[PDB]
Amino acid sequence: NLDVDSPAEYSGPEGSYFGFAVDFFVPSASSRMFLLVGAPKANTTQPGIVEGGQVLKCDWSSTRRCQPIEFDATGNRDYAKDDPLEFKSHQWFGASVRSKQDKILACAPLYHWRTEMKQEREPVGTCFLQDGTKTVEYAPCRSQDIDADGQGFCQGGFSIDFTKADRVLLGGPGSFYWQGQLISDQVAEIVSKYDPNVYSIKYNNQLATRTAQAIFDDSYLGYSVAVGDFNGDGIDDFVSGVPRAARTLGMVYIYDGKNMSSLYNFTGEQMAAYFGFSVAATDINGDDYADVFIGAPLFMDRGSDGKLQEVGQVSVSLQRASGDFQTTKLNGFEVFARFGSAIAPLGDLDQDGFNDIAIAAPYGGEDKKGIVYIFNGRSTGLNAVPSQILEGQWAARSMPPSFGYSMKGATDIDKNGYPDLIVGAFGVDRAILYRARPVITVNAGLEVYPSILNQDNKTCSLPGTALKVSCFNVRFCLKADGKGVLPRKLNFQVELLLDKLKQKGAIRRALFLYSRSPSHSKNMTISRGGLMQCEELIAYLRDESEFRDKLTPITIFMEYRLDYRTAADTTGLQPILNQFTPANISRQAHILLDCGEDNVCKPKLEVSVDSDQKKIYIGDDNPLTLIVKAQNQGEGAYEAELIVSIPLQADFIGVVRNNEALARLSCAFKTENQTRQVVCDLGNPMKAGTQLLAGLRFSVHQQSEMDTSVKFDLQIQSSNLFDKVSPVVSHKVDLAVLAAVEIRGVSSPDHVFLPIPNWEHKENPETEEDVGPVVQHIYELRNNGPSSFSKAMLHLQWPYKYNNNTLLYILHYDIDGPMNCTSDMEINPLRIKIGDIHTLGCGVAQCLKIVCQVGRLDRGKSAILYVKSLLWTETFMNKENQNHSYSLKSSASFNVIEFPYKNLPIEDITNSTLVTTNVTWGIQPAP
Amino acid sequence: GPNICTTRGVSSCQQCLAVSPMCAWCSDEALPLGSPRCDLKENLLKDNCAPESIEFPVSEARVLEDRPLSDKGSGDSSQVTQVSPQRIALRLRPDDSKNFSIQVRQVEDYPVDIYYLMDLSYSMKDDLWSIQNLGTKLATQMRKLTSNLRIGFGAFVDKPVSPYMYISPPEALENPCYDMKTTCLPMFGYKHVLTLTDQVTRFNEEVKKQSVSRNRDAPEGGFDAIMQATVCDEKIGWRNDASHLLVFTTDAKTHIALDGRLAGIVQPNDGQCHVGSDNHYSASTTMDYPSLGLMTEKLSQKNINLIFAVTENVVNLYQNYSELIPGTTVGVLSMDSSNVLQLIVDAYGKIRSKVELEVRDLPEELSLSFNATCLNNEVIPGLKSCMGLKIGDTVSFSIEAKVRGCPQEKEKSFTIKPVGFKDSLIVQVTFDCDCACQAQAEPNSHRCNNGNGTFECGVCRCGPGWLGSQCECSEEDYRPSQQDECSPREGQPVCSQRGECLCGQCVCHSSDFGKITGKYCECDDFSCVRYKGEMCSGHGQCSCGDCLCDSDWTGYYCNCTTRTDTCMSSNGLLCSGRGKCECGSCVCIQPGSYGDTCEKC
């Protein structure tokens, strides 16, 4: 977050691995500070020593000069004449360096030793401890355990560390058939028992691990070490890595720091990931309980395609008061990068209160120069997303740069208040120091109390003219604070924009008062204290006619800038702003909405309905007009729409058009989700406190015999954010049954003149001509009513005879449509081959009656009865009836006995009709 | 209602192609104003977009090269093919996908190459004696399984450096076994012995001149030998068109990467061939062991199938290792290697028994899935391999490919191949998108008023603050260009509330129930009356609320016909001249006449 990228660079002799192991040096006897860097393959001036190695301490400022430390200058001691006791050549001296105050500890893992008992070359290893003045040699593994089964191959010093109480920790991975070992000693004892003439010194206070069963061979315990108290006794307990344990799964052992008992065992998840390559212990969450970090450089993750890829992993095991750890995993970012090779605690890097850690990927990045990731701790644990990425800047020379292969931190080299980082790049023989920039936190308090501007409030005068404009105010405040060394005053350059949303290329409508500009800037000073350095100004709007984007709010925008150049220290170290800072804070205002004080208009959406008709006759399918008015007497509504529902049997004919005193509408129909809803638009905006009377036309094709009324629902909806929709309302009208059958009847001819031409009396007739003129009848019947009826009866009465003399004679009848007929007397009873007027009819004449059944008739369905008859000329030609005019009368009736719509009220319908035939004389007696 | 292709309001063909695969773009200049420019091909085609102007790219998969799967092979190679099809042309839209199938068959008699990599720690003296005749016996056994065979050899102990090496008194430098009073070769990292050859008896003649060596610690540096056996192809003679077997016989666990740091070795393994004219491994003493991740990469690259022929006491360890390296298998090598031959044959048998696919060079923007049909007419979604195949069987896979966005480079090619086979299927992808009407855009031509926009696909994509199909409107210009009677009546809204006016012209936005029209958005084609649930009874065309009935229909709803056939009487005249035909029925005006044709009286 805050490490610089203009660091101090150190270089060593070519091919010396300078930078393999690095750390700081903090003497208590001097104010100055120095770095320490190891060069395991550097040549030295010792007699006959080839690539002996050396550790160099480099000044911070004196031209970055690096100078060797003169640990020793002797050659191989001789156990006897031309019988070397030790082989310092290629001993890798300086492979690991640790320091604590005036104490420096360096080790030579490959130092070879010829045991007294038998001349041999065993890589026992050694370490040199240098106090402020005195120098001694610490080789715990150089013992009588000459054989490989003992400690001959301890390689003591492969890793080292210091405890709080000045107790050394040293690991040798080769002891006991490469099981490994872990040896600790008191510094005071080490610097008080050294003797050049004694090669295997037997320390008293030392404690160390011991041999185990052969099943544990090739475990490499001690490959990496760290320290931190987990027992809770206040004394540091040893952490170590065992990369080959558990069938190459890898394990991490924690040993009690007081008597060397075992406390915990961590086990790797994947084979050959080399879990435990490097370990570290630091409190990443500021709980005062030290957490554990374990690296698995070769862990193979598998991506989306499922192919395993080598990216590396680091395991974070938070400590908990209960004694158990909480674990999470952190994978690498690139293939073959070997993420997790080095894990160096940084201490509270940004002084935010939580310790931070850096993890290295020495073979990643572009051109594989190496990359280092910085992670920031927090109360919940480690932040899984790196906040910074340092990168290499050198190319390989027969060797990968390996930038980040070894690191160190948690020491404030320049006393700027923050720790720093040393990164080793032994691949290119370099060491680089990154200085931590002081972190400055800032706060912005922009606010605008005239959040809604009334155009009428033209209180402020336009500068340079008497014209007054509606004005508006802006206030912005800053304050800065940070830990460590910082100037007591800081210069901030800030920017303001009034209608930034129009930066798309449109004309801005808001302008600053005095500057008459849409944007403004200020260069101001703050005293790095808690006092807010607020500032205020005035801004105004363009005239009302100049814009119409009332709904679009004005956007107020701010930015601030540090003058890093002026805030840098004597060494040119710029400060830096904290990570999570909204450097682009903003506000807004509403040109102005209709409801005034409130943007969100809350319409009181309301509706009332009226009906032209109150009952619907089934089967009529006649249009009916429904009247509805939308009022919404409350606040205004935007994009208000009317919703109406009708059943499947109903259809929306459309909007009413024949009414001039009734408002029209735009309407449509919807069936989405198998619905039957009508949609109409009221308007946008629907004005508050208004009433809009309209009407609609509908028709129902109802034919069911079970339904009795219609269901009709209505609702109003708008786009308003609050009080969006009106409550549902309904209307009701009942179904009705109206079947209307008709009977008319007809006769042809309707009158006759006597005597019949060429007619004469006979004893008895046999054909039509023996009787007289033909008379025909048609009794049509149809249901003119909208509703259907199931059963009806038809009746006819006929004046057959008067005074035992026939008047009209029926020959035959025919039926059309669904009817059947029966007669009380045999039709064609004689089976014949097919002035004042007196009235005759069934009331006085012998009456023949006919009844017919009628089936169901729907709207307009009809059946017809046809009848043919003859006029009896004999009766009128008889002496007693001569010269007298006669009128013959007949009557008919019907009844609707049943209806199909049983669920609705039903009643019978009846009526009657009459038909007549007239007889007169043409050849009348002389007057 | 309207689809996302329309409602999303994309103003460019390229945008529409990214909206959804189903969207289609019209470049017709004669497109009516307000007509949906881009929409589902069905709707837009119903709007009679000219085929000469319709733009609708569609994903496709065309096979470019297809040799038939070989049946016997093993002779006159002539492109012995084991995968079909070999080359496919693929193209896709930002949100499209396609299905193509790959067929895999394992030729029965395919050639074989066997390289015998034998650990030579001191415990292997008995094994070395035992396998002296492995040559001829192996040839006779394999001849039952393939007609052409090649055999090689190689040995490895460990890096010749302390702490592994015996740097004990000088005798150990020239005879590490002098401690037990025996003679053996000074240890070594890896020595190539015999290049692969058809002459089998050379294997016997060479293996009988070898000797064991001795190292200090238990783990052995085999992985160096494996890497060198994979990458040094020309020294060892791996064939192009053949099956590759690497037999790795050892009786002890192995060193892994980062184990070299105990010695003075820190430099990783770059994975290159360092075997010189001398058949030894030069970089043994200056270079760490190879990681498993690198070994798998090299094995997959070189098409090597590696068999772990390890002893009983470490079978579990190498089984767990092989679980991480695709294509490997493990067998129980007896303590004296008496059963190495049968182990090799059985390992070959169960290595040919499985087919698995690898995808390489796949771009990030693409992603694909698999369906397997291994043992019968069955489908196993997801699985990429088969577990019970018999030599000579045929297998099929179905591949589904998916894409995101139109990438920056329009063409990319990747390879899909089965594990361990030279044969491969290379799929070359031709990515969308572009449109013909956009390739011919006119930069700031006067087709757009005074410029102010670039013409393309019939529409000027206007510049900053410019609006309209011809950039006739500008937000900045809207301030001076005060609107004048956007609607005919002062006090009424500038337009019908369905829209607003810019520079005196109304914009109707959008509608779901139909198309908006009119000078003031006051007319459309969906507000007319309905009859029997159909607007204008389906016998007329709506226009601004009026049903324009067809010639055969009349009335407000167009529900009544003017047809004469049903009203014509037998005399050839309508209603017998006594009435007028209405709604298909006659209404009689002559007194006394009635009926549908005025035929009754």
Side-chain angles (χ1 to χ4, degrees), chain A residues 120 153 155 218 223 244 247 271 274 310 336 405 502 505-507 545-548 651 653 683-684, chain B residues 1 168 216 219 254 256 258-259 261-262 266 291 297 317 320 475-476 478-479 482 497 530 533 594:
Chain A
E120 279 294 355
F153 286 73
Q155 296 204 254
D218 309 278
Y223 199 101
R244 276 189 66 99
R247 287 156 58 179
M271 206 87 153
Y274 220 80
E310 174 190 313
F336 299 120
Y405 187 77
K502 292 282 173 169
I507 181 67
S545 59
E546 307 200 68
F547 253 84
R548 318 84 175 160
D651 181 12
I653 291 180
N684 59 80
Chain B
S168 296
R216 202 180 287 271
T254 57
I256 37 168
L258 307 168
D259 281 349
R261 193 178 144 164
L262 262 71
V266 178
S291 59
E297 183 197 302
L317 164 56
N320 282 266
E475 145 61 10
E476 305 204 327
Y478 203 54
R479 180 171 75 98
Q482 292 295 312
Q497 296 184 348
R530 297 183 172 246
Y594 68 101

Side-chain angles (χ1 to χ4, degrees), chain B residues 55-301:
Chain B
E55 182 64 289
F56 185 65
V58 65
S59 175
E60 287 297 350
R62 184 65 176 186
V63 171
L64 299 189
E65 184 55 275
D66 181 24
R67 305 298 99 198
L69 295 160
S70 303
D71 51 308
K72 290 312 166 182
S74 197
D76 306 342
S77 176
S78 60
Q79 303 179 348
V80 183
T81 296
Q82 302 200 59
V83 172
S84 166
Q86 294 84 49
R87 187 187 283 262
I88 283 176
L90 182 67
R91 68 184 302 172
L92 277 152
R93 344 210 318 171
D95 199 56
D96 206 354
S97 301
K98 234 300 188 185
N99 67 310
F100 60 91
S101 177
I102 176 174
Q103 299 170 23
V104 187
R105 193 203 287 176
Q106 299 207 65
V107 172
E108 65 172 47
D109 201 69
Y110 209 61
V112 179
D113 296 349
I114 301 182
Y115 191 62
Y116 195 91
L117 189 54
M118 189 194 213
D119 180 346
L120 286 183
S121 53
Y122 194 77
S123 55
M124 290 265 171
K125 202 173 182 180
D126 56 354
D127 308 1
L128 185 62
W129 173 256
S130 301
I131 69 154
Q132 71 184 275
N133 284 314
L134 182 55
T136 51
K137 297 191 297 187
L138 182 54
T140 52
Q141 279 290 334
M142 301 285 328
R143 275 207 295 98
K144 90 203 305 185
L145 203 51
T146 176
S147 154
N148 182 258
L149 183 75
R150 290 194 159 198
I151 317 185
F153 183 81
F156 66 86
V157 181
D158 220 351
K159 292 188 179 298
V161 71
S162 193
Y164 323 126
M165 193 164 193
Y166 269 98
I167 212 161
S168 296
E171 285 95 297
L173 295 168
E174 57 180 8
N175 171 17
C177 302
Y178 92 118
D179 291 306
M180 61 213 98
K181 174 38 216 77
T182 65
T183 183
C184 62
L185 272 53
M187 66 177 282
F188 43 88
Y190 161 59
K191 89 167 88 82
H192 179 71
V193 177
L194 171 55
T195 299
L196 294 168
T197 60
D198 305 67
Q199 266 274 11
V200 171
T201 55
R202 280 285 304 299
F203 187 96
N204 305 118
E205 293 169 344
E206 292 296 341
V207 83
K208 286 161 68 176
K209 296 201 296 281
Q210 293 284 350
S211 283
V212 294
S213 191
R214 180 169 169 252
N215 60 330
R216 202 180 287 271
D217 59 345
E220 312 292 6
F223 288 3
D224 283 357
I226 287 170
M227 268 297 288
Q228 290 306 289
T230 58
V231 298
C232 291
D233 59 15
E234 104 295 12
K235 286 284 298 154
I236 294 154
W238 292 114
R239 284 189 287 176
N240 288 306
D241 298 342
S243 194
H244 304 126
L245 297 182
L246 176 56
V247 177
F248 178 87
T249 59
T250 179
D251 63 350
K253 51 204 178 189
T254 57
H255 283 298
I256 37 168
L258 307 168
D259 281 349
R261 193 178 144 164
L262 262 71
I265 298 164
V266 178
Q267 175 171 359
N269 208 292
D270 51 9
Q272 296 297 353
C273 181
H274 294 284
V275 178
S277 55
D278 65 338
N279 287 292
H280 285 73
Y281 178 38
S282 308
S284 174
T285 54
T286 67
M287 202 145 178
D288 205 354
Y289 303 90
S291 59
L292 271 69
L294 183 67
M295 265 188 321
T296 78
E297 183 197 302
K298 250 61 197 180
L299 287 165
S300 168
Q301 184 170 114

Side-chain angles (χ1 to χ4, degrees), chain A residues 853-868:
Chain A
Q853 296 86 10
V854 192
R856 181 184 179 137
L857 294 184
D858 306 322
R859 195 183 83 220
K861 304 305 185 182
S862 67
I864 308 175
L865 172 67
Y866 307 83
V867 187
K868 179 176 166 176

Side-chain angles (χ1 to χ4, degrees), chain A residues 747 749 752 771 773-777 779 797-802 805-811 825 828-830 832 840-842 845-848 867-873 875-876 886-891 915-919:
Chain A
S747 187
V752 178
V771 171
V774 174
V775 189
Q776 192 266 9
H777 268 69
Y779 290 95
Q797 306 198 16
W798 186 271
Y800 175 55
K801 270 178 173 184
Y802 174 74
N805 290 320
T806 309
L807 301 171
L808 301 172
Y809 183 95
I810 307 178
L811 285 162
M825 145 173 263
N828 206 352
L830 299 172
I832 291 176
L840 291 172
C842 279
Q846 182 173 15
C847 189
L848 176 155
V867 187
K868 179 176 166 176
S869 73
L870 301 163
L871 177 64
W872 231 247
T873 311
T875 300
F876 309 103
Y886 295 91
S887 187
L888 315 179
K889 182 171 181 177
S890 68
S891 64
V915 183
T916 63
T917 287
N918 302 306
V919 186

Side-chain angles (χ1 to χ4, degrees), chain A residues 11-31:
Chain A
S11 180
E14 193 78 349
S16 63
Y17 286 5
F18 174 91
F20 192 88
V22 302
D23 91 5
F24 289 92
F25 181 46
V26 183
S28 68
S30 62
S31 55

